[PDB]
Amino acid sequence: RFLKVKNWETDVVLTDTLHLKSTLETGCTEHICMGSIMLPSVATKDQLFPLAKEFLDQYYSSIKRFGSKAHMDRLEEVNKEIESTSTYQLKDTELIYGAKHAWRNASRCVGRIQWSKLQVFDARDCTTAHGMFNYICNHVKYATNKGNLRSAITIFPQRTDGKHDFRVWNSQLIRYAGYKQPDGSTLGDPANVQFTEICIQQGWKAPRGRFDVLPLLLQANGNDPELFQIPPELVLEVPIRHPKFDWFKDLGLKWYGLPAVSNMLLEIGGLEFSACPFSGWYMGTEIGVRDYCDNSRYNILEEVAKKMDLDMRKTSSLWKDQALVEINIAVLYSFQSDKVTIVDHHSATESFIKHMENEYRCRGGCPADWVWIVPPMSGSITPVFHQEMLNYRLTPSFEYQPDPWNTHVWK
Amino acid sequence: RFLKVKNWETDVVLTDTLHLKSTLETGCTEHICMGSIMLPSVATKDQLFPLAKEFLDQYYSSIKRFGSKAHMDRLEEVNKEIESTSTYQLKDTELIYGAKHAWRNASRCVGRIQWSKLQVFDARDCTTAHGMFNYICNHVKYATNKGNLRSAITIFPQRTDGKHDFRVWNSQLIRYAGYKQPDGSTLGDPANVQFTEICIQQGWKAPRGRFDVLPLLLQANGNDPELFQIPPELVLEVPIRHPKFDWFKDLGLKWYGLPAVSNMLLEIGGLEFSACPFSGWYMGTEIGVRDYCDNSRYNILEEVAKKMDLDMRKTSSLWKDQALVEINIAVLYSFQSDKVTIVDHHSATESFIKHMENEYRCRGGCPADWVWIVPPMSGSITPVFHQEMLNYRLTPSFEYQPDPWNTHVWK
Numbered sequence: 001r002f003l004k005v006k007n008w009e010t011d012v013v014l015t016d017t018l019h020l021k022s023t024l025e026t027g028c029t030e031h032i033c034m035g036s037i038m039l040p041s042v043a044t045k046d047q048l049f050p051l052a053k054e055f056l057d058q059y060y061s062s063i064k065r066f067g068s069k070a071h072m073d074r075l076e077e078v079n080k081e082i083e084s085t086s087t088y089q090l091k092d093t094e095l096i097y098g099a100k101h102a103w104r105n106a107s108r109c110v111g112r113i114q115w116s117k118l119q120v121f122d123a124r125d126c127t128t129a130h131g132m133f134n135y136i137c138n139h140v141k142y143a144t145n146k147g148n149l150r151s152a153i154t155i156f157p158q159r160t161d162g163k164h165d166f167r168v169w170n171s172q173l174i175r176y177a178g179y180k181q182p183d184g185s186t187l188g189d190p191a192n193v194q195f196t197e198i199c200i201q202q203g204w205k206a207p208r209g210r211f212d213v214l215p216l217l218l219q220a221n222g223n224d225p226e227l228f229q230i231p232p233e234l235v236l237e238v239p240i241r242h243p244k245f246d247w248f249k250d251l252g253l254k255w256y257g258l259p260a261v262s263n264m265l266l267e268i269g270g271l272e273f274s275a276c277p278f279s280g281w282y283m284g285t286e287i288g289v290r291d292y293c294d295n296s297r298y299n300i301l302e303e304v305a306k307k308m309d310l311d312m313r314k315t316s317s318l319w320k321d322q323a324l325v326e327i328n329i330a331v332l333y334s335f336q337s338d339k340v341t342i343v344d345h346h347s348a349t350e351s352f353i354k355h356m357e358n359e360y361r362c363r364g365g366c367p368a369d370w371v372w373i374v375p376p377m378s379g380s381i382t383p384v385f386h387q388e389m390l391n392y393r394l395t396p397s398f399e400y401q402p403d404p405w406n407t408h409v410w411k
Numbered sequence: 412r413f414l415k416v417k418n419w420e421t422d423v424v425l426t427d428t429l430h431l432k433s434t435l436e437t438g439c440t441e442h443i444c445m446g447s448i449m450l451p452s453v454a455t456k457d458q459l460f461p462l463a464k465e466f467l468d469q470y471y472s473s474i475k476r477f478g479s480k481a482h483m484d485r486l487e488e489v490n491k492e493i494e495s496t497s498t499y500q501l502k503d504t505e506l507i508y509g510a511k512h513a514w515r516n517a518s519r520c521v522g523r524i525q526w527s528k529l530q531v532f533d534a535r536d537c538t539t540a541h542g543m544f545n546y547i548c549n550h551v552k553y554a555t556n557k558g559n560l561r562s563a564i565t566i567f568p569q570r571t572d573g574k575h576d577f578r579v580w581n582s583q584l585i586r587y588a589g590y591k592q593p594d595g596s597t598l599g600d601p602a603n604v605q606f607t608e609i610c611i612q613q614g615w616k617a618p619r620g621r622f623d624v625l626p627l628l629l630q631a632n633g634n635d636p637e638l639f640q641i642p643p644e645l646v647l648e649v650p651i652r653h654p655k656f657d658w659f660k661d662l663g664l665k666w667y668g669l670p671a672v673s674n675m676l677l678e679i680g681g682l683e684f685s686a687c688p689f690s691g692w693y694m695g696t697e698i699g700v701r702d703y704c705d706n707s708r709y710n711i712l713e714e715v716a717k718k719m720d721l722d723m724r725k726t727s728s729l730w731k732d733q734a735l736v737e738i739n740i741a742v743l744y745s746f747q748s749d750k751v752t753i754v755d756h757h758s759a760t761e762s763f764i765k766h767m768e769n770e771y772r773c774r775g776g777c778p779a780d781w782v783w784i785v786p787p788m789s790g791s792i793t794p795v796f797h798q799e800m801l802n803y804r805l806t807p808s809f810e811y812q813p814d815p816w817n818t819h820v821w822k
């Protein structure tokens with residue numbers, strides 16, 4: 001009832017009581033742990049008031065007015081509005097609180113030491129695809145801030161009936177296209193091949209190259225989605241050079257500065273915001289390890305090891321590992337030399353331990369998903385490899401949601 | 412009731428039904444996952460027969476005589492012997508079956524493709540510390556096999572009352588000593604500092620150096636333990652050179668060929684074998700990443716990066732990662748050039764996926780602990796990073812047990 005997590009490198013022990021306020025389920029049971037399953041498992045007015053009340057009781061607690069009159073009047077006000085429309089509307093303050101704490105509660109996010117410094121753009125007055133484009137361009141421009149990146153989220157109107165739903169069909173506001181080839185190979189980003197051809201379906205004219213920024217596909221109030229091209233001046237990009245190897249530029253690689261996730265669902269007080277793109281900045285490994293070297297992504301370990309003149313015959317020459325570190329020195333070096341915000345897996349993981357100490361201290365705990373927090377390389381030489389973590393689902397939260405093209409009752 | 416695990420690099424799906432035969436609990440519940448907790452949570456005649464029966468029903472099933480007369484007579488034979496002594500004795504065949512399947516069921520072991528090729532040394536006639544030494548030297552000599560290593564386990568008499576207990580007090584048959592210093596630093600292996608001084612307590616004369624092979628501390632039939640020195644000729648060692656950097660030899664490093672774990676408990680049919688050292692061979696990362704570069708181990712990242720002339724000012728030069736790969740090229744190269752069996756994290760992880768396919772096919776599943784199966788470096792460039800895994804506790808099993816010096820009713 002008062003659980004202990006240990007760090008096995010520092011011998012530091014923390015006591016978790018926050019997991020007692022946990023609500024949802026994890027997928028694990030007493031006889032089976034599913035902590036490595038990637039994706040694990042309309043609303044009525046009955047269900048919706050407990051959710052509103054629970055969220056409002058923590059909101060008013062957080063402003064040092066738990067149970068005051070303004071709390072009770074706000075409680076009954078929401079109760080009354082849920083009676084009338086079987087839904088309700090968040091105050092601007094409540095919306096910003098919910099957004100920040102959704103991030104605070106994201107147990108797979110290593111960057112949460114920043115969770116309270118988040119810019120919330122209320123787009124709940126939006127009605128059209130064009131209005132979404134406008135809101136999204138203002139997000140990008142603000143969050144990029146000339147490479148001095150700033151964290152932000154833009155929140156579109158909440159789901160109501162179900163068939164009226166705002167959705168960004170992109171998985172990220174900014175992604176590179178991916179095109180299959182005659183010989184079955186792939187140019188660009190293979191992750192995006194189905195999306196890239198969906199855009200060509202609804203009308204995109206593709207410039208079939210490597211790093212073609214996809215257009216936006218924006219669906220407003222449940223209508224069919226519409227293509228829009230982000231102005232290239234708002235899309236900041238970093239060419240990848242190496243601080244030692246000059247052939248590295250001949251690799252011709254580049255990536256975009258701004259990671260801005262757009263396919264997730266924000267849940268606040270039982271209300272569901274299906275379109276809520278959020279941006280921060282990159283941990284270096286996301287590009288250099290996963291984006292570039294995932295076998296099903298750009299898969300450049302081949303070419304980098306060639307130019308390094310490595311023993312690629314044997315598996316045990318560790319030529320893959322050796323070419324993996326160079327590439328990540330190059331991403332970091334490139335971003336930093338351009339004053340574009342990036343963090344390295346070492347600095348990021350150290351901050352998360354520092355963040356963990358604060359949450360356990362001033363909150364009773366910190367939900368954390370070791371499988372996702374440990375970086376995809378140099379695991380045990382970062383402090384989080386050695387840090388026991390308790391995972392559990394608190395709310396407000398970010399949830400996965402189906403892709404709109406698999407669910408949209410079309411016309 | 413018929414769970415699915417996916418590989419997100421191959422899109423391969425496996426169906427797990429073996430977890431239905433799971434028995435023990437995992438530490439996880441519906442509202443909290445503890446899959447990153449390192450160590451998670453006398454027997455009576457009532458409890459012991461169901462355990463015997465369950466184990467015998469799977470043993471006789473495995474020899475294609477499930478429910479035959481020989482099964483029923485063996486069932487009643489054990490039932491009768493449990494009535495008489497409130498314990499019982501395993502047949503030699505049952506002991507070998509149990510040992511192999513304990514390994515087969517070790518969800519943290521990446522090397523399980525070999526689980527059926529295991530040499531079982533029945534030491535259940537042992538009575539004294541000297542007899543343990545003899546059995547243990549024969550284990551080492553056999554398992555080492557001139558560097559063509561062979562997997563083996565030596566099984567000492569099962570626990571009976573509780574105060575009569577065979578225990579190897581070493582955590583591994585072969586470990587390097589660790590000595591604290593005047594200035595508070597550490598020579599040798601810091602993991603073993605408490606054990607190293609325990610040996611000096613009971614009588615060891617230490618040669619206070621780096622790589623001093625500890626003596627054995629062997630406890631038989633619950634008596635106080637006794638020191639024995641393994642004959643240095645049976646202890647095979649590999650000096651660590653690099654195939655490029657000749658200063659690497661001036662580092663003067665070396666490690667022992669044979670990983671042989673001795674502090675664990677083997678559970679078969681409800682019977683508890685508290686002394687059961689098992690050996691196989693090394694995955695390269697165990698030495699090069701963990702043994703050598705754990706901050707609380709030999710911690711050589713400092714010196715290797717110095718000799719490489721790396722930018723050690725900034726964290727983001729990835730100088731730690733760059734010096735980590737060289738060291739693991741060196742361990743593999745050294746072991747291989749000496750015909751001493753070693754496997755690299757790439758070859759080992761690929762075999763585990765191949766092993767996983769067989770178990771799901773011909774067994775219904777394979778318990779697997781992603782946190783422990785993924786290697787401590789180059790995680791996502793190995794196939795197990797992308798492989799969902801279900802963890803659950805089957806039996807026969809290997810269990811952790813307290814250290815004997817924290818529990819032994821002494822004299």
Ligand code: HEM
Nearest residue numbers: 103106108109110111114151153278279280281282283398
């Ligand atoms: C400020 C800089 C940030 C850094 C350095 C960072 C870092 C990361 C990384 C490396 C991941 C794993 C993603 C993956 O491997 O696919 C992640 C996950 C996540 N981040 Fe953070 N992030 C940042 C900002 C944010 C912000 C501003 C939000 C929300 C407003 C957020 C919410 C999340 C969520 C919900 C996940 C889980 C995604 C999933 O389960 O697929 N992050 N973060």
Ligand code: HEM
Nearest residue numbers: 514517519520521522525562564689690691692693694809
């Ligand atoms: C044949 C070569 C083998 C290889 C390459 C191998 C590899 C590994 C590795 C890398 C680990 C993680 C250990 C750690 O990080 O501390 C492990 C764990 C384990 N291995 Fe295997 N192993 C082998 C043989 C064996 C044998 C012969 C047995 C038993 C008879 C065994 C039983 C176990 C168990 C029980 C664990 C879990 C230890 C724990 O939970 O602390 N292994 N193995």
Ligand SMILES: N=C(Nc1cccc(CNCCc2ccc(-c3ccccc3)cc2CN)c1)c1ccco1
Nearest residue numbers: 111191258259260261278279280281282283286419
């Ligand atoms: N710094 C950041 N990064 C970051 C943060 C959150 C989320 C993500 C993206 N998370 C994607 C994980 C994922 C999703 C779907 C699939 C997939 C692939 C094929 C088929 C089906 C699904 C695979 C993966 C990764 N394995 C990145 C960042 C972005 C915004 C703020 O901060």
Ligand SMILES: N=C(Nc1cccc(CNCCc2ccc(-c3ccccc3)cc2CN)c1)c1ccco1
Nearest residue numbers: 008522602669670671672689690691692693694697
């Ligand atoms: N190839 C092999 N390897 C291998 C296999 C099984 C087990 C092990 C050793 N597993 C030790 C894990 C461990 C235990 C205790 C502590 C610890 C440290 C400080 C205080 C208290 C406990 C820390 C760790 C590692 N974090 C290695 C091998 C050996 C035999 C066959 O195959």
Ligand SMILES: C[C@H](O)[C@H](O)[C@H]1CNc2nc(N)[nH]c(=O)c2N1
Nearest residue numbers: 385386387388447448449782783
């Ligand atoms: C905190 C964490 O559970 C702990 O450091 C684990 C992580 N995974 C591991 N994996 C292996 N193979 N060996 C280990 O010692 C550990 N340690």
Ligand SMILES: C[C@H](O)[C@H](O)[C@H]1CNc2nc(N)[nH]c(=O)c2N1
Nearest residue numbers: 036037038371372796797798799
């Ligand atoms: C199978 C496994 O759960 C899957 O590959 C996960 C592992 N950990 C991860 N961790 C991060 N940060 N991102 C990921 O995409 C994944 N993928």
Ligand SMILES: [Zn+2]
Nearest residue numbers: 028033439444
């Ligand atoms: Zn779990």
